[PDB]
Each structure stands twice: as C-alpha cells, then as structure tokens.
Design a binder for this molecule. Structure first.
Ligand SMILES: CC(=O)c1c[nH]c2ccccc12
Ligand SMILES: CC(=O)c1c[nH]c2ccccc12
Ligand SMILES: CC(=O)c1c[nH]c2ccccc12
Lengths: 291, 291, 291, 291, 291, 291
C-alpha cells in the first residue's frame, strides 16, 4: 500500500469527514457474527474498527451471536436435542450451555480482542444490572405456532443505564440472554436483539454483518443486488428470501420502522467492512431506510 | 420468630448501629464459595445480604470461586488432566473451560440471585475494561517450585475504574480471570484474588466465607478455636494448619498487612453469616488484624 | 439479649430488608413529642434511631413540639395568660417565649443528642433561609371561630431548599415557627406542621409519636384498637375521639390525602418505636392509607 | 439627598469599585453587637448591608453577642448569680439561659431582619452539624487564673462544612455556643469567636462593630485616635486600654496574626458603618494589619 | 468629593441596593456608541462600569457601533462609495473594511479598557462559534425599498452558547457582523442588533447610550422630555422624531415588545451614565416598558 | 479516486488508528501560514482538517501569521515604514494596522472556513480574557541588538482558561497580539507564539506549515533532506540555514525542549498536509524530538 501516492492516501481520509460529522457522539449498534467472527484476520480487524470508532468519539455497541458454537458444545456434552420443525427446543439444560458459551466463551474472545487497543470492551447480558428483560416467544412450524423452550424477544431495555455505560466510554459487548419478568433467563436471537437495542438506545445506524454481498431481490440473479431500499418495499419483498436472510431483514425493518435512521446489511467477509460501510461510499452493503 | 417479644426485636436492630456507622460508605470485599454457594437456602440468604449492605449505603464487592464446578465440567467434556503434585495443569483448553464455567455459569447464578432484589449485580473478570491483570505464578511441589500452566496472582488492579463501578451503585461479581501483560488470560485462585481486590480498593473489611466455624490453633481441640489474632502470631502459626485453611489464611495476611483494617474467616454454613459477622457481636468467625 | 441464639439475631435483621429497600433514598418525617421527648432513655434511643436511618441512606426530617415546656417558662416568667375557650392567646410576648423555648431549648437537646453519633442534626425554623411561611389560623370555641393571637398553619414550604439540605446529608430538626407574608412570626401546631412538611417534601412515611398504643375506635374497649385504616373511614370516625387524638389524626388525614403513602400513629413510650415501626411487622402503631 | 447633584452620586458609587474587586468572592466575618444591635434604625441598616454584600457576590458571616440580654433574662428568671472577680459563673442553668437567649432570641431578630431582603440568613451554633467545638477557658482574677463555669474558646472549626454553607449562598448568623470534646455545650465570648471563625474560614476582612470611633492610643486625648496600626505595635499597646477595648483588640490580633489580611474596629453607632468601612476611604474605624 | 459628609456617602450606596437585588444574576445588554466611545474619560468610565456590574454578579453584554470610524477608514483607503438615498452600498470590499474596523479596531479598544480591571472582556462576532446569523435587509428610500449590499438584521442567536460564555464570567464585546444562511458575512446595524441580543438572551434591561438627554416628544421644547413611556404610545410617536432617534427607538420597541422588561435611552455624555441609570433614581434617561 | 479498489480504501483508514489513539483527547497546535493560507483549495482543505481533528476528539489550536498582508495594507494606507536592518519598526500606528489585519481580516477568513463545518472556530488574541501577555523583544542587526518598536515574545499564557476554551469544544484561532505588563499591545512573531502556546498547553504535537518539503541539511542538495532529527543536532545545525527557515526551526527547538513530544515542519503546499502528517507514515515533513 506504500506504492500508493501520498496525495491519494490524503483524499481517502478526507472523504471520511462527512461521516465522521454525521456519527460524532452517536450510538452505532453492530450485529457481529459469521465469517467475521470465525476468521482470525477478520476478527482482529473488527476489533480494531470498534477501537477506531471509539477513538473518534463514536459509540459502538456490539451484539453477538454464536449459534454454531452452541451446537458444538452441546455435541461435546452429549446433550441430545429435541427438534420441532427445524428448531431445537431450549430446555433449562440447553440454556445453561447457551449462556455459558455465548457469555463465557464467544463474548470473551471479542472483549479481549477489542481490549488489546485499550480498556474499552465490557461484557454483559440482560442479567447484569437488569439491563434488559426477555419475553418468551413462540415459533411458526409449517403453519402452526409452537413452543420451543426458553427462547424469547427483548422485552424492555434499561435505556438510561445502557447509555451511562456508553457515556463512561465503554464498548458494551452483548450476549443475548435476559431474564423474563419472573427471573427465568431466556436466550434471544442475536439479530432481533440487535434491532431492539439499536431502537431502544436511539442508535444512528444499525450494522448487520452477514456472509453475503448484500440483499438480492431475485437471488441468484447477480444484477438483482440492490444498494438501498425502503421498509415498505422490503416488507412486501421479505416472504421471498433465502431462509438465512429473513432474520437479518426482519431486524432492519423492526429497527428502521422503530426510528433508527438507517440499518445496513454489510459483507462480514470483507476485512474492515465496518470502516468501509461507515466512512466510504464504495460499500457493498445495502442500506434500509423508512418508507 | 414472632413468639419473640417486640422489645427484643427492637434491641437487636439497635445494636447494629455501631457497625452501620463504621461501614457507611465503605468497601467490603467478600470471598464467596463453599456450602454457602451450593446450598439453595444459604445462596438466597447470601444474595439478600449483598442487597442489604447495598440498601445501607455499604459497598460490597463479591469475589467467587468454583473449583469443584470446573472439575465436573472437565469430566463431562472428557478432558484428561495432568497433575504435578496435587495440582492440575491449566492448559489453554482447561483455562477456556474454567473461564466459561466461572464467568458463564457460577457468576451468572449469583448475579441473578442478587438481582432479584434490584439492579445491583454486574459480572466481570479482569478482562473487562482492563480491570485487573494477572502474573503467572509457580507452585511448590514437595520442595521444588513448578509450572502448572496459566495460573496466576492478581498483578495490578484498575482501582479507579473499579470504584467508579461501585460508586455508580453496582455490586461487582468477580470471576477471577485476567490477562497477563501479553493478553494471555490466566485463572487466579479466588481466595488470593479477594485479598488483592480488598487491598487495592481500600476495603474496610475482608470477609472469607469458609466451611468451618473459625480458625483452630490445635485442630481437633475444640477449645483451641480463637476469636481474634494478629498477623505476626498467625504467620508463625500458618505452617501448621489443615491443607484447606492455608489459602484462606494467606489471604487474610496479605490483606491485613496490606492495610485492610480487618479480615474475617466466617462460617459460610450459617444462614446470613454476613449479617451476623458485620452487625452483631455474636459471630463465630475469627478476626485478623495487624500486629 | 446475649442468651438469644445467634441464628435468630440473624433472622430479625434479615426481615428488615423489605423495608430498607422501600425506604432507601426516601424522606421520612417524624413528629417527636411526648414521653419519647421527656424520658432520658427514650430520648437517647430516638436520637440513635435518627442516626440509624441516616446511616442507611434514609432521610429523616424531625418536627418537634414542646407545649408543656412553653407553659412552664411562661410561669417562670410570671407572664399571665389569657384564655379563650381552652386556648391561650399568643401575644407578641408569648410568641417570643415560645420561639425561644422551642428553638433555643427543646430543639437544642435533640440536635445535641443526635449529633453524638455524627454531624447530622441541624436546627431550623421557617425563618431560616425562608424555609416556610405561616398563615394565621383561627379556632373554634364552642361553636364560634375565634382569634387567639399569632398562631397559624404552615402556608408554603421551600421544598427545593429543604431537600437540598437533606441531600447534603443533614437531619433537619424543625421548630415550628415561621413568618407570615408580612414577616410576623407565628407559632404553628407541631402535629399539623409535620403533616405539611411530609406532604411538601414528598415523604414516603409520616411517623407521629404519641403516648398511646394506637388508635382506638371505641376507647376504652381494648378490643377496639385497629392496626390499619383508610382516610375515608377515619374521617367519619374523627369527631368521636379523645380531645388529644384529634390533632394527631387530622395530621394523618391531611398528609395521606395529600399524597403521602402512609402515616403512622406509633407508641412513643416504646424504646426504639421508630425502628420497630419501620423495620418490623410487630409494630403497635396504626397505619393510615388513602381510601 | 436628592439635592445632591447626580454627577456626584455617580462618583461615590464609582469609588466603591476598587473594594468590590478586592472582596469579590471572599469571606468577610462581622462581629455584630452594641448600639448597632439595639437601635432600630442601625439594626435595619446592618441587615440591609449584609443583603448588599450578598447581592455583590461577597460572603458575609455574622457572629453576634448579647451579654446584656442574658443578664436581663437571668434577672427576669430570678436566677441569682455567683461572681468571681467581675465574672459571672456560668452554671449549667446559666448556659441554658444564655443559649436560649443568644440562639432563640437575639439571633432570631437578625435572621428575620436580613431575611426581609431574601432567603439569606440562617442561624447556627457550633452544635449544628458539629460546625465548631469549644474548649473550656479559665480567667485571670487579680493575678490568679480561675474557673467560671462552662465558658470557653473556639476549639476546632468545620471549615469545609461552613464554606459549603456559604457557597450555597447563605449568610450564617452565628450564636457562639458549642460543645466541648465530651458534648457539653459552652458559651464563647463573641469577640474571640469572630476572630476564630475569620481565621478558620480564610476571611479577607474581620469587621468588629464597637460603640467607639476607633482605637485611641491615649484616651481621652482626641488627637490620639489612630487610623491603622500593626500587630506588633498594638500588642505592646494592649495592656493600656479601657476594660471594654481589650476583647475587641485581642480579637484583631489573634485574627491578623492568624493570617486574616486585615481586622477593623469600626463605629457601630454610624448608620451603614459596614458600607462606609468596606466601600469608602472616609471610614472612622481603625485597620489592624500584620507587623 | 471628600468635602462630602461620610453619612451621605453611606446613603448613596445604600440606595443602590433595590437595584442590586433586581439585577443580581441577570443579563443587561448595553449598546455603546457615541461620545461615550470617543472621549477618553467617558471611555474609561464605561469600561469601569462594566467591571463594576461584573464584580456585582450582574452579566453585562456589550454591543458596539462604529459608523464614523468605518467612513474614515474607507476614505483613508480611497474606496469610493455608492449612495442610494442617504445609504452607502455595502459592497464585498466595504464589508471587509467594516468588519476589520469594527472587530479589529473598535472592539479591541473596549476589550483592552475593560480588561484593565481583570480578565473579563472577550470579543466576538456572529461568526465565532456560529453565535448568530444575519438575514439580508432592504431599505426604504423615499417610498421604495431598495438593496444596499451586505447589510442585514440579526436572524437567529445561539442563546445557549452565548449564556455559557456569560456564565463562564466573560463580558462579551460584540461587533455586529454575522454570516447569512450561506456563510456570506453581513454588517448589522448595532442598535437593532443590541435589541435582538437582549431579547434572545432574556435580558433584564436594555441600555442604549445616546448623545442626548432622553426622548423629547416635541423637540426642541425642553419641557417635552419624558421620563417613561409605553410601547404603544411610543410607536404612534415614532414617525415624528429626528432622523437619529429612530434607530435607538425602534430598538427599544423591538426589545420591550419582545419581552425585555425595560429598555432605556440614556445620556452617553454623562460620566458613568450606566451606574446612574442602574443604581440611582436621578437618571436622565427615558425608560420604555410594555403597553 | 473511485477507480481505487475498496479493499485499499479500507486499509488506508485502518492505518490511521495508531495515530487516532496517540492523539485522542490531546492538544495539537498548528502554525498556519504560507501558500496553505493564500490558495483557495489548500485553504478549504486546511479548515476541513481542523474539522476532522475536532470530529475525532482531538483538540486543534490554530496560530496564524500574515506578514505579507500587513505590508500590503500599510502600502494601501500610505504609511511609510522605517527599517533597521531588514526589520520594519512597529510604531503605534503600524501595530494598530497589524492588529486590525491579523485579527479583523486574516483570522476572520479562517474562522469562517472552519465554521462551514460547524460551530467550532473562535478568534482570539492575547487581549481577550487576558489569555496571554507579551514581553517586548529586541533584535540583532549585524552584530548589535536593537529596538524595533512594539514587537515581542509571548510572556505568560493563561493555560487554564485556554484549555477550558478547548474542553468546551472550540477551535481557538489565534492572532498573535497581546498586551505587555502595562497593557500596551505588542505584535508577536507567529512562529514563536505557536511554540509558546504548544508548550504552555501541554500539546502532544506542534505542526508548522511551511512552503518547503522539509528541513534540508545542505540545501540545495536534494539528498540532504532529513526525516527526523534531535534538538541537540538541529541546534548546532541552525546557524547554517536559509533566512526563512530560522524562525520555523527555533520554534521547534523551544517547543520540543520545553516538553512538547514532537514538532513537525510539514509542506503547506500539499493538500491536507495535516492529515498526511498526523494519520499516515508517508509524510514529507521532518520530525523534531528531544536529544
Ligand atoms: C466494568 C464496568 O463498568 C461494567 C461491567 N459490566 C457493567 C454493567 C453495567 C454497568 C457497568 C458495567
Ligand atoms: C449547617 C447547615 O447546613 C444549615 C443550618 N441551617 C440551615 C438552613 C438552610 C440550609 C442549611 C443550613
Ligand atoms: C476566550 C473565550 O472564552 C472566548 C473567546 N471567544 C469566544 C467565543 C465563544 C466562546 C468562548 C469564547
């Protein structure tokens, strides 16, 4: 990159300024999962980007998943699962494993990566300081909605305590587990939790790292890839997408409808995808806004 | 307890006042382990006592162990251990399990118990916000000191950030894991970590919950049980005690020598042992002070 | 009290916690008079209880009477009184004596008692920092309302300045004298002033120390003693009580109707009646709530 | 005063500015007694001057006496005094009367006068919030020092709490009574207490209102009246003055030696003597400074 | 002034107190121009008066003109003017000169004068910290409104940032230049700008220094000079006054109608006219209030 | 710049992070003059860079020159100069012109440029709020030191008030004029003033924009251009450089010796030279550090 003329290094940084101004002092919630979480080089770049935002006076809040890691640990423990539809039943035993993997394994890796750049990251679940509660959710299995154990949606968020934590300069690394109104901890889909945290905290942007270039209207058609879309159009479009895109898309709608100015589905396989999406116009993601 | 005359209910509470004054606004560090951690009734009482202190404007900091739980999980995972002397070697794999059990299992139970009384508890390790570092320790096996993996002592403590967390009204629940100066996370003996946190934070008292009535000079002699002792006497006495008492005792010396006004070894099998030790003169523990 | 098993000392303190939580950070106004003011042992216990509340992060505000002491001083001064009905006329001369006895004698004893436990108590009248004003009141003498000099009801309260004084950690000891809108100081019935301070400051509880076990519906019938009653019932009941109970009762109605969650008439002849009423369910008082 | 040309009204106020700057933000302690306390017109002017200072962002602290008023009340109460030398013995009974007269009578008049201009004045004794303690003093009766009861000198001052009270915008009206180290309240000479408060609070000036034009070297010689004098000269001069001037002079030395930049003995029979001494060069007082 | 008896120096200062109370903590905006700006003795007195206000905890904000100085500099620069009606066209070149004279010459003199008394004065234009914007204004030339270049009225004021600057203790010296919504700086009539700043900042008073004794109803009739007048009367009166009085009068109406309690037209040729108008009843100015 | 692959736009921004961390929360003083001040494109880029720093939570302080502009205005005014050596004598008349050009012309352009990005820039001289004083300096003319009027060096800096201004979020644009100890304003060489402000405010870096690539040891030898040098080496080197480099170099020594970690001489003819020097390793400047 040193064969690059210095006058063009200058212009790339200069073109970041319109977005430094837009995001100064603001909350950006990032859903982090996928190849950006499993590959070492993408990992270290993601953590450096959180340090970047932080050293610009931007306020990142990281919400992370970890589905495949939970599965692996359940297999290592010989815990036989029950499956309704394509869904595993979250028994009390499965939750304990989920919680212990999400918070005591996956969240730890990111906290330590980020913290290589300074005392920024702090891990939390909705259990800590009663930061958020959960409400048990049911699922639709081929027509009928059904119960699959201690799985839920974010219920209420302690908006005030969360933003105190962020104003104190900390990067909250969130593992999506929270107690219900009776104190029974549920596991929450990390995508939908990111959308709820973003809306609760008045985030300026929601970033959803995904293992795809962006939203395709008519996948596989390469020409069908869109760069920006409104909630109304995207809602009518949603019952048409690959099984894996539904949660990422539903998050963007819930968030953007809920007042978050924009939600972005960006390519987590691109090194420093966060910096390219936020500080560059050459991003590959797709931006969702209200309409 | 209602057959108890009201005029004596009155006097018991009145006699708590000399200790409410002594402890008002102050930090009390509690090592929590043993039967007080495994039994349901003692569990709920311990958490209620932390809520009590907190609702008196006293500042508890909880440091917890969990040795037997780590062993069990290693056995459930089929992870064969190596043993030098009576010590298990903490490989990278054993640390990941320890960290995931301490922080993602044991600490969670206490956070949720305490938090049944309000938004108080918050879990943390030395990894979060760089709260404390670790230095690799060696051990003495029948004469010679040896290496047993990623096990260490608390190195430095972020005293300022810790007391901000406490002034914000939070009860820090600490899992004893922290990175070394190179970012490699070590597991720390929970007893010695409690002594280091107490001294770093200028605690007024160190409470060490133990499965015994108190320190015996000449165990089994029931008459040999002492109520208070100075560091000088207790140091010359230390090479004489049951294997299990050494860590609890070494903690009290390191702390009290380090300026903590008193450290107490109290009976964790007594319901509300924290309240009896702090707000009553009828305690069963033994108090260590400087001399 | 040492013959009392330690496990029951433990449970008495544990049962205080539901009320420590309820009252944490809150204002409790206490009317203090009667035998609790004249007997040495009750005196010292009352002051220790104010220190207790304070060392729990509860905010006591003490309003005191002193009728019999004013009478005595007037007799020592040879000041002949005029009496309309059963009421002494408060001339300018009688007010000066009242003010000087209430603020310069009675309030001083309590300030010095409380302050034996720390720098808490501070004496004040509505004159200081313009904390509250008075409005001249008339009285009903056998049918007709009449003028009995410079006696009044609390008019307006400097709510903000009062709670600053309390947030600064001080226990306000209030002598019920205040200027009217023209600067002429009036004496205020201490019971009704306690009710006005409690309502103005958003107190959580009003405690009225009285020389009786509690409110009797049909005094002398011992069985007629009630433990809790609503304002509607008690209002229809009020024109039936002993002459001395009317002021204590009228205070509870004015306060509870005014939004104070509960007002209590408690036995001031019981040592530490404040602690038993607030931190115990075995209290002898009667609780008034809205309805 | 309206026959006075407007251009000279202008210049008088303009010439106040060098002293407005000198005193801005600073503490001025005023001993108030004598004819300035007993005459109605001087009274109202003194209180207006305290309001003046306050509305300039200057911080007055008023310390008041009241000897003759105590005597009168003792006579009205038929309390026979004991006299060693020319000194009355302060029995427990005499103290109660002194305290009740100073704090519940004399201090009240000034609080209400000052407070006619706003919520400024607040009465206090060393008893309140433990603001200051007293140490029992003995006296010299024709050669030998002797005990005359509960009379003392200011021992320690809660400098911090006092200046918080002043930074909150309040004019402390101080009655000179305070507890000793055992809680027994003593009465303190108001002149010497003013000197101790001034020095403790880092006052810029000490004003001592007196019923005289100023210090005379060789009273009655009218020419012997001095305008300024150093502590060294005045100390060698002190054993030569009228009985009444000794306390006012000893106060100025203790204060000025103690670091107060200047202490002034000013004519309390001059209306608005405070304003003329502070904001004018035409003052009649005598200024004491270090040397 | 020393031949003046001290008891009358006392009374002049005492009579300032009703206005010290009225103005304590408040904003007073002063338009400064005319002979009070050009004469050395009036200059130094004006600056001392701003220091006076400041050392009373009053908040002056100074808005200054400088028309004749701009003319002179344009003549020294040989810049030929264009005149529509009696108005000079403010070309880009004339603005640069105006800005450079107002801010870099006239404002500097006052900042340095005021600052001889302390670190108070600070110069600013609407350009600094975006304190205020301008909107291009047109003028009426014998019937028709016309364009005379980059001249405008104050558009919006950064009320918050301005009062932060004043709460920090600074005396803002304002040169009336500000950018329009496109960033093009305009020059603003200093009289109308004073009226807009006073209203924006919630000023208690607007002072307009003028080279006249006050408003005359029927100039030259000496008897026609009025001391106070309401906005309704003065508005119907405005189309009758000397050309020079219109701007000063229009300012007072815009301000007083806009909620400023009073605006004063005072004689800037009187030394310390600010002190006589604010702290004396003998002022020569005329007070405008709402009606 | 869009033909540039997105993965290299990503890496350029990522490589800025080590310097974002180094400079976070810190003061950077920039001397601004030369072609970077006169050319429109460099102008707008410099102001955007100050906005950049500011939107990263870095604290720029801009010190500007303007020598050639003063000369031009003196010529436009027909003010004949006196010259001792190669130095113009700064008469009172020349200072007024300098001050009016520096503060009322040159500083205004930069304030308005910067402020196009937000309410950041604020102009000031040492006159405002007494921010800094000047001490008259003499100069060396062919051997002998001589007087050339009201020209000086920065004497003392109000470090506290300056950093309050910066903590409030403002970019101070400094025109180098300040009063001496008698209030007579002097003009200060802008290079030496930048060095004094940087050292006074504890700046992390001093940037000196210059119309050259960097320091040449043996100019014209292109190979003699150095990238970094210590103060000791550079001091022995100083009496060898082109007349124009002496002031820029003397500034770097005074600053770096005074504790500023590094001072940089950077090419002001390079667009966004500030961003390339601070956030890139490809800079053309030369870095001075202590040794
Ligand atoms: C280390 C730290 O500040 C925290 C770690 N977890 C937290 C939860 C709520 C508030 C603060 C924290
Ligand atoms: C010693 C003290 O703080 C006070 C004593 N009396 C007061 C009245 C209002 C506010 C404060 C006080
Ligand atoms: C020296 C100072 O505080 C200021 C000088 N100009 C300013 C403009 C806005 C806020 C502050 C200032």
């Amino acid at each position: 990159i040193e064969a690059l003329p210095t006058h063009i290094k200058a212009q790339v940084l200069a073109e970041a300024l319109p977005w430094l101004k837009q995001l100064h002092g603001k909350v950006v919630v990032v859903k982090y999962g996928g190849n950006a979480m499993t590959d070492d080089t993408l990992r270290r770049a993601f953590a450096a980007d959180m340090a970047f935002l932080r050293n610009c006076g931007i306020h990142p809040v990281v919400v992370h998943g970890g589905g495949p890691q939970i599965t692996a640990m359940l297999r290592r423990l010989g815990i036989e699962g029950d499956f309704k539809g394509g869904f595993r039943v979250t028994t009390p035993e499965v939750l304990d494993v989920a919680r212990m993997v999400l918070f005591g394994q996956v969240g730890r890796e990111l906290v330590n990566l980020i913290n290589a750049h300074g005392p920024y990251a702090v891990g939390i679940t909705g259990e800590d300081a009663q930061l958020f509660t959960a409400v048990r959710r049911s699922v639709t299995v081929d027509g009928v909605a059904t119960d699959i154990g201690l799985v839920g949606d974010v219920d209420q968020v302690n908006t005030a305590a969360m933003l105190d934590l962020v104003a104190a300069g900390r990067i909250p690394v969130v593992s999506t587990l929270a107690p219900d109104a009776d104190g029974v901890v549920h596991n929450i889909n990390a995508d939908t939790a990111a959308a709820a945290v973003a809306e609760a905290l008045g985030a300026e942007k929601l970033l959803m790292l995904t293992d795809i270039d962006g939203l395709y209207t008519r996948w596989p058609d390469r020409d069908s890839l869109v760069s920006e879309i409104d909630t109304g159009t995207l809602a009518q479009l949603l019952p048409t997408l690959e099984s894996g895109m539904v949660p990422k898309v539903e998050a963007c709608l819930r968030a953007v409808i809920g007042g978050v100015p924009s939600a972005h589905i960006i390519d987590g396989r691109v090194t420093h995808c966060v910096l390219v999406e936020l500080f560059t116009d050459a991003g590959t993601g797709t931006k969702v806004v209200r309409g």
